[PDB]
Design a protein around this ligand. Structure first.
Ligand SMILES: Cc1ncc(COP(=O)(O)O)c(CN)c1O
Ligand SMILES: Cc1ncc(COP(=O)(O)O)c(CN)c1O
Ligand code: NA
Ligand code: NA
Ligand code: NA
Ligand code: NA
Lengths: 278, 278
């Protein structure tokens, strides 16, 4: 079902999943002032844990958050995995909040639940997306560190609101665009498209999250002799592409069959992408 | 010290302030997916509670959050006020989160703590501000409801990050600006300035929060024969003004004596503003 472990006096303490763990005054709750990582649990193991802990360190640095370090997080992951069924794919989230303030200790915990059946169905059968503007110029966040570009924060209200807006239009998910129409990323995923025999993704300098699933695909692609590129694409690139995916550590590769109500095929390229991500 | 009440089976239940109240899976914590209000407690009373509950309803509507209604919130405010010292000014926050998801009940609670001594000192002695761009055009959010303009959400990571960036420059607080340099609002406050015998504030259509302290000042000003205006001002207006304040329900009227390192007087206008807010 569900498993939680909290960082308590330099140790991981298992607590029941329904038991409250955060007080009213925690800044992760009241201000969305914290960071997180979402780690896949597959056959009772965390195949990409280290990639996620490296990015956790970077997120914590951007928010000036003291981080308990890799050892602590592996102890918390171990605690929630203890009784986890290998046959049940899980999502293990790591939360690090400012706690009661800068000066008091940050709050660390791990929470593990099943990947929902609808998320597995999106991986199997793919998705529709709506393009929604963020209204920020593509070049703006590189000059505005207070906007927390490239950090994976607890402040995802907009990310969730964009998804519900999409759902209201009849789409599964979103691709965000800059003011000038440049592709950014999904609310919870990285955009990749195939065009001219090359795998493409938008540049990180635009203030998006550097996706671990997209990075591992590109590394694997390179080795398999599939050319890759960082490309400042637009919605035009998505319509024109041979294939479009949203990639994330939990959902995986979700082929985008529909962009703003415009149906699209994948050129039977999804299979090699899935093989490379395996 | 601190007081908390949680909405439990249609009643306000007092819990100790140090006691955890939110589980790991609460979307207010993991996604910053909720709304809040901050209510002043002055001589053991909530002088502007109704103004805050009206805006709570509007915030909840924008996020598609079922809200427990005014009666419930007054019961929760009553529960935390019960043993509160009248001599100690407080901040009573009301949190409404999506809870475990849309379909399961939203999480409601009230949390009361003292207004910190440094916040009272800012009210007494005023503040320095840094202007920081949001990089969104002034007209953009009115067309992009997924950006949650005009909603007061738990997703304030950027709001807090801007303040720490200001603190690093040697400023107390921030005024956000649009892409074209239009004044928006503070991370936690409303900008007002005095110019040509008129009290000015930026337009709400820019996607800012409609401030209850600024609204009550303007109503009072009107009655006292101080002209008021909604004005699409820029940073130039702040430098040029006779006086600049940041207004909020907790800090109150904080005279801004410094804008981007440029010291400024208030034309001895603060006293009439404070009298009108009394
Ligand atoms: C905003 C955002 N962008 C991209 C991603 C994809 O990253 P990953 O492939 O590491 O899961 C995520 C999920 N962490 C995300 O939340
Ligand atoms: C973003 C923002 N803007 C403005 C304000 C000022 O509103 P109020 O005067 O109602 O406290 C607040 C404080 N609620 C705020 O958080
Ligand atoms: Na997903
Ligand atoms: Na796959
Ligand atoms: Na304040
Ligand atoms: Na005053």
């Amino acid at each position: 079902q569900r498993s939680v472990a909290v960082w308590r006096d330099g140790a991981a303490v298992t607590v029941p999943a329904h038991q409250p763990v955060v007080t009213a005054f925690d800044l992760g709750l009241g201000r969305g002032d914290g960071i997180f990582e979402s780690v896949a649990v597959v056959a009772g193991r965390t195949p990409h844990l280290a990639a996620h802990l490296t990015r956790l360190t970077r997120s914590a640095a951007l928010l000036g958050l003291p981080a308990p370090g890799d050892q602590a997080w592996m102890e918390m992951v171990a605690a929630v995995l203890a009784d986890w069924p290998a046959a049940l794919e899980g999502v293990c989230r790591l939360f690090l909040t400012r706690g009661l303030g800068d000066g008091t200790p940050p709050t660390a915990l791990a929470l593990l639940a099943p990947v929902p059946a609808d998320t597995l169905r999106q991986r199997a059968e793919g998705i529709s997306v709506a393009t929604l503007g963020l209204g920020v110029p593509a070049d703006f966040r590189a000059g505005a560190p207070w906007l927390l570009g490239g950090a994976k924060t607890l402040s995802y209200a907009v990310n969730m609101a964009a998804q519900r807006h999409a759902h209201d239009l009849g789409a599964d998910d979103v691709v965000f665009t800059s003011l000038e129409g440049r592709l950014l990323e999904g609310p919870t995923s990285t955009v990749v498209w195939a065009a001219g025999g090359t795998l493409h993704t938008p540049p990180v300098e635009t203030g998006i999250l550097p996706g671990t699933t997209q990075a591992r695909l590109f590394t694997a692609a390179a080795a398999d002799g599939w050319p890759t590129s960082v490309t400042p694409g637009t919605v035009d690139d998505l319509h024109a592409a041979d294939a479009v995916w949203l990639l994330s550590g939990v959902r995986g590769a979700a082929v985008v069959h529909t962009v703003d109500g415009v149906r699209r095929g994948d050129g039977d390229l999804s299979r090699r992408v899935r093989e490379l991500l395996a």
